[PDB]
Design a protein around this nucleic acid. Structure first.
Ligand SMILES: [Zn+2]
Ligand SMILES: [Zn+2]
Lengths: 216, 24, 87, 208, 81, 129, 96, 100, 125
RNA sequence: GAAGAUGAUCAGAUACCGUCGUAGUCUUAACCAUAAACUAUGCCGACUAGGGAUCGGUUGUUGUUCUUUUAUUGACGCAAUCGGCACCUUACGAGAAAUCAAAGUCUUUGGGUUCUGGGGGGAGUAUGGUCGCAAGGCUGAAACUUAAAGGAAUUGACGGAAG
């Protein structure tokens, strides 16, 4: 059995908190991966790159294995996880844990017309990690994920079906490639648009309405 | 070698080149 | 965001900061939700009834949150003659 | 708005003035210019204790909104505030954190003293940076006791005071307990004397 | 200080700011009526006078120019216009 | 030296808007600045702005609301034909549904949507979104 | 700002500047100078016929240790003598 | 890369400062960059202050000190251990050591 | 040196935090106690624990030990640290019946709607 | 004190160490026009975050000593602003990082303008021109050759470095 030790774990185990958006709405820090597992039961893992780093010691080289893992539900939630461990399987396993903890929602929007279900970004957003800068430009309904294979795999798992991409810098650094792409896909909700201008009243925090079921 | 001495070695070499052309 | 046929295609409409109107990101772990209690005239705190402010980690990081509280509480009737528009 | 009963009673002003609350730091940092009334000719600043009072009623009004009393955790690294925050939690049902604050309490969930407070009150940001710094990671609003030199980053609500006075730390901590209990109703009204006397909440030297 | 009233500044800070840096610049100099010791006669003297101004009454300098305001001679009184 | 008051205006606006300030002083003012703000004001991107008269070039106090993403000039003021606008909109604006291209025309200072309605073109003057 | 002219009447200064700086590019410099037409043994050609003069075995560069079997060929189009590789296990025997 | 923001010297808003000769090795060194130590030592050793105060023909004669300002270059000072190498974070500190 | 190690030091305090009332200041009693309290496979090990558990026990008598709480020390202190004299030492009774506050800071009081007598002090330095 | 001569040291040192020493070092008339000529950071303009010292000016002010016994003395002390040379913290932001109050306001890419670079060598070489008494300066390739050269930082290893 799974025993939560945090308030969010307390509330997720009951029926108090059911929508991940409620966690997203109030910026509730997700420290426990099983919180994600129940509330996002349909997630997809796929390892982008496995790398061996080496620490020089007096006797010789100390080799650890580094793996990068991408999680997404193809419906607006995507997560990235990079973990180093002595064994590839352990590093892959531990990466999935933290790849789930960093899962964020994405904003699908319309290029041009708003006819049908959203197909792309609402705006052009760019992220930078190290030297890699990845820009995503909304595409028409025909043009798919015009991107490099590693960046495209992130978008397929995020549920963006049409988008452009333009990369700069040392794009052969896979780790900084995915983190910079992750920054862009996460800036979809950080950009103000006119349709969001109206003020909505602040809903009461879920930890304050069920503090009795969240205390312990 | 050191850059300053490589520069000086060429300086003395150019001076020899200039003189040997003066013979003609 | 709303499509042609009218249903809300937007999920997770985020809140907006009360100081700088900036959107509160999904992982803005410096963002708080200040709650202040409404009081019956008998000096006792009303139960389950609070004025809610959303405050961005940007304002907190700059240390302007206290001033943003002072101006908001002054203009919402919560606070008397401590914050002044003219400095 | 505010019923007039919440105004600074002249009884409290005599307490505040004697307890040296109106004594500020020599140098005021840019954000506490509002709370400086005037400067004593020696060079040090005078607090506007009139401004101070309704801030206490404002800050205490935050604590009442939390449904669970154990969710509010107060801290003090300064010795002069260790006993006061201890008595404050005792009368109020808070979750005091006296002395050293162990890093990882708010972020590391396998630690022992792993607490998830909905509000952190700070005796001094200058000496309690770590409590304020980690509260920035897990969405915890912070109420602080700030002098005119006390930095004001990541502080949602500040209470101007004299943090370097033995009497001042206790009294403002004394005032918070009384004003929190009034709102919840334990103290009969704003005219009834509190059973606790202001000499409690004062740190005592080991002589006695 | 995210929000403050620039259109209505406090007078104390305006008296401390530079004469050019105010919301609308305005000289801090003025004009003086100097009553000399020898006799009483109205004479307009600039506060920042650059010339050793004498009165038409008596051939006596009222002020000696300095880096800033004109320094009034002893025994002379002034009144600001 | 001071070569363009319009550039010095939107920059101080952006250097205030990112900082989260709700007001910004613009110096010096001009008709081009004043008419530029009106196109911004009728779209709610800024609030009530005041003109100070000092018997001089003028000053402007702007009130900020927080709905402004990025306002900047396009310098030099490129000549824009009616078939030149779609290129300027694509490169400068994040999306096809919002954001504006401020064009100065013989009919006045206007954004590209009001320009296309009355089918007039001039020199590009800036952008706002 | 950005160090290059932006004024509307400065199209000339940009035209000269770019054309000057294309000379630092070796692809442009090799094409315009016509170094292929002058110093390249084929004279800018794709293939060439030549006449074999002598067969040579060459010691390899480090770290490889082998023999690369090439030949001395003089070209018929311009009379230049340059070495050409014979690439195939045992194709040295086919060429005389 | 850049090791110090002051470039090892104290020359700002200036073009040129006349140099000084190291006390030890007579090396030219710029005056601001030279490590300068002002010493005031007793002229007689602390052990001999007594017997030289007994041979004094003058009662309560206050003997003089010796005044000397010392200049060292970086190699002069480091080798004599007047200054020592500090850590990267301790390089920022320029407050005097608290030994006297 | 006779420094005890951590494995005996942590095992000693886990006993106090569990069986403080059954502990004593006498080593012999603790020696026999830890035998039926903890399964200690070595006789030499068992004597080391009790010899330092007693030292921890013999320390609590001189005052509170740092880092060890046994569900009673704070309780003994909860009703021990309740002292207060009859005078608050903060009410205006030590002085003549009015404040000694600064004359310039009295303007702060006078700015408010208060009439509080004050023996003004003017250090001016 | 280059050069040179010298006494040591050394396997050898016409090097470091020691003793002399000629041009030079100084100056007046003229050339040369280069330096790690460095803030390795073009110049002009605007804005952005706090803080305290300090220089020149100027503006209001002291339980201060002195002029002189006081002013209209001076110095000191406290508030201001102008301009500087800078310094401390923070990172809204930038950066590959070191770091940066500019190296920010740069994929949300546009204030004006000048110059410069396009992998490492060959090479600032050859040649031509041009300036100079000369030494040299300015301009300035190619053939050929090479898969690296290099920047910041991490671990270790090593030091005839400190603790
Ligand atoms: Zn007269
Ligand atoms: Zn040396």
């Amino acid at each position: 059995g799974w025993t939560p030790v945090t308030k969010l774990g307390r509330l997720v185990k009951a029926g108090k908190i059911t929508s991940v958006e409620q966690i997203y709405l109030h910026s509730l820090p997700v420290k426990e991966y099983q919180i994600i597992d129940l509330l996002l039961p349909d997630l997809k893992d796929d390892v982008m790159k496995i790398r061996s780093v080496q620490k020089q010691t007096r006797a010789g080289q100390r080799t650890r294995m580094k793996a990068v893992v991408v999680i997404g539900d193809s419906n607006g939630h995507v997560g990235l996880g990079i973990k180093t461990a002595k064994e590839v399987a352990s590093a892959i396993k531990a990466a999935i844990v933290i790849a789930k903890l960093s899962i964020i929602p994405i904003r699908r929007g319309y290029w041009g017309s708003n006819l049908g279900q959203p197909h792309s970004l609402p705006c052009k957003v760019t992220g930078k990690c190290g030297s890699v800068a990845v820009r995503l430009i909304p595409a028409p309904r025909g043009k798919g994920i015009v991107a490099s294979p590693v960046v495209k795999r992130l978008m397929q798992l995020a549920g963006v079906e049409d988008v452009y991409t333009s990369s700069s810098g040392s794009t052969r650094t896979t780790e900084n490639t995915l983190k910079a792409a992750f920054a862009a896909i996460g800036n979809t909700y950080s950009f103000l648009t006119p349709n969001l201008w109206a003020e909505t009243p602040l809903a009461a925090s879920p930890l304050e309405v069920y503090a009795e079921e969240a205390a312990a | 070698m050191r850059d300053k001495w490589r520069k000086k070695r060429v300086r003395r070499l150019k001076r020899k080149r200039r003189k040997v052309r003066a013979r003609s | 965001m709303e499509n042609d046929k009218g249903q809300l295609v937007e999920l997770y409409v985020p809140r907006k900061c009360s100081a700088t109107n900036r959107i509160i990101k999904a992982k803005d772990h410096a963002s708080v939700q200040i709650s202040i209690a409404k009081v019956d005239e008998d000096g006792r705190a009303i139960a389950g009834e609070n004025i809610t402010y959303a405050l961005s980690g940007y304002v907190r990081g700059r240390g302007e949150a206290d001033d943003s509280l002072n101006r908001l509480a002054q203009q919402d009737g919560l606070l008397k003659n401590v914050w002044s528009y003219s400095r | 708005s505010l019923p007039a009963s919440f105004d600074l009673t002249p009884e409290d002003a005599k307490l505040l003035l004697a307890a040296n609350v109106h004594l500020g730091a020599k140098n005021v940092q840019v954000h506490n210019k509002p709370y400086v009334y005037k400067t004593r000719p020696d060079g040090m600043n005078i607090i506007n204790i009139g401004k101070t009072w309704e801030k206490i009623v404002l800050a205490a009004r935050i604590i009442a909104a939390v449904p669970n009393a154990s969710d509010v955790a107060v801290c003090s690294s300064r010795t002069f505030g260790q006993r006061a925050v201890l008595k404050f939690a005792a009368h109020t049902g808070a979750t005091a954190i006296a002395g050293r604050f162990t890093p990882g309490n708010f972020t590391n969930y396998i630690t022992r003293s792993f607490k998830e407070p909905r509000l952190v009150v700070v005796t001094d940001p200058r000496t309690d940076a770590q409590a304020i710094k980690e509260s920035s990671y897990v969405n915890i609003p912070v109420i602080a006791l700030t002098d005119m030199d006390s930095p004001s980053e990541y502080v949602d609500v500040a209470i101007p005071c004299n943090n370097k006075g033995k009497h001042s730390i206790g009294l403002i901590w004394w005032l918070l307990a009384r004003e929190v209990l009034r709102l919840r109703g334990i103290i009969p009204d704003r005219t009834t004397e509190w059973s606790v006397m202001p000499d409690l909440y004062f740190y005592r030297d080991p002589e006695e | 200080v995210l929000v403050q009233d620039l259109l209505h500044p406090s007078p104390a800070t305006e008296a401390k700011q530079h004469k050019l840096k105010t919301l609308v610049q305005q000289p801090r100099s003025f004009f003086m009526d100097v009553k000399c010791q020898g006799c009483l006669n109205i004479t307009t003297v600039f506060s920042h006078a650059q010339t050793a101004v004498t009165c038409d009454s008596c051939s006596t300098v009222l002020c000696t120019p300095t880096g800033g305001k004109a320094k009034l001679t002893e025994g002379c009184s002034f009144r600001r216009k | 030296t001071r070569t363009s008051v319009l550039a010095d205006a939107l920059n101080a606006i952006n250097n205030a808007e990112k900082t989260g300030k709700r007001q910004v002083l613009i110096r010096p003012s001009s008709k081009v600045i004043i008419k530029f703000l009106t196109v911004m004001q009728k779209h709610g991107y800024i609030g009530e702005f005041e003109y100070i008269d000092d018997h001089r070039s003028g000053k402007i106090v702007v009130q900020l609301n927080g709905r402004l993403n990025k306002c900047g000039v396009i310098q030099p003021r490129f000549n824009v034909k009616i078939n030149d606008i779609e290129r300027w909109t694509d490169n400068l604006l994040p999306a096809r549904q919002f954001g504006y291209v401020i064009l100065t025309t013989s009919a006045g200072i206007m954004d590209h949507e009001e320009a296309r309605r009355k089918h007039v073109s001039g020199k590009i003057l800036g952008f706002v979104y | 700002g950005k160090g290059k002219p932006r004024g509307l009447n400065s199209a000339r200064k940009l035209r000269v500047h770019r054309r000057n700086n294309r000379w630092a590019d070796q692809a442009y410099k090799a094409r315009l100078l016509g170094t292929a037409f002058k110093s390249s043994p084929f004279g800018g050609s794709s293939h060439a016929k030549g006449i074999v003069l002598e067969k040579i075995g060459i010691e390899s560069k480090q770290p490889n240790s082998a023999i690369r079997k090439c030949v001395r060929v003089q070209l018929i189009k311009n009379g230049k003598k340059v070495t050409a590789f014979v690439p195939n296990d045992g194709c040295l025997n086919f060429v005389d | 890369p850049k090791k110090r923001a002051s470039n090892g010297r104290n020359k700002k808003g200036r073009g040129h400062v006349k140099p000084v000769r190291c006390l030890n090795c007579a090396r030219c060194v710029p005056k601001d960059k030279a490590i300068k130590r002002v010493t005031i030592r007793n002229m007689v050793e602390a052990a001999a202050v007594r017997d030289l105060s007994e041979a004094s023909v003058y009662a309560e004669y206050a003997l003089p000190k010796l005044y000397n300002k010392l200049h060292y270059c970086v190699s002069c000072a480091i080798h004599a251990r007047i200054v020592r190498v500090r850590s990267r974070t301790d390089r920022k500190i320029r407050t005097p050591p608290q030994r006297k | 040196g006779r420094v005890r190690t951590k494995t005996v030091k942590r095992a000693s305090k886990v006993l106090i935090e569990r069986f403080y009332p059954k502990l004593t200041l006498d080593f012999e009693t603790n020696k026999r106690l830890t035998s039926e309290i903890a399964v200690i496979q070595s006789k030499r090990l068992r004597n080391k624990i009790a010899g330092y558990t007693t030292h921890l026990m013999k320390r609590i008598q001189k005052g509170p030990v740092r880092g060890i709480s046994f569900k009673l020390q704070e309780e003994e202190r909860e009703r021990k640290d309740q002292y207060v004299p009859e005078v608050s030492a903060l009410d205006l009774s030590h002085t003549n019946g009015q404040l000694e506050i600064d004359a310039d800071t009295a303007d702060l009081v006078k700015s408010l709607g208060f009439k509080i007598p004050v023996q003004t002090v003017s250090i001016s330095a």
